[PDB]
Amino acid sequence: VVSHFNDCPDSHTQFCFHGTCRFLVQEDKPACVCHSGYVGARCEHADLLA
Numbered sequence: 001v002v003s004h005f006n007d008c009p010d011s012h013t014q015f016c017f018h019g020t021c022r023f024l025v026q027e028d029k030p031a032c033v034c035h036s037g038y039v040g041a042r043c044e045h046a047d048l049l050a
Contacts, residue, residue, distance in 0.1 A: 001026075019043025 008021035008030055015021065019032030019042070034043035037050030 014042075016041075016043040018046075 004025035005022045006025065008016075008023040010021075013021050013023055013030040015030040016032040016034070018035040018038045019030075020035065021030040021032045023030050032041075032043050034040065037047055039045050039047045
């Protein structure tokens with residue numbers, strides 16, 4: 001934890017689109033900070049009243 005979670009290389013980690021992901025390597029898992037005013041697991045739905 002923290003160690004191998006880094007800052008996602010955004011080629012594949014398109015698990016999120018507009019999502020500044022932390023690529024949890026020990027889990028092989030992208031998990032995302034959706035950009036300011038977006039929602040979604042894939043951080044693609046602008047949250048209208050965003």
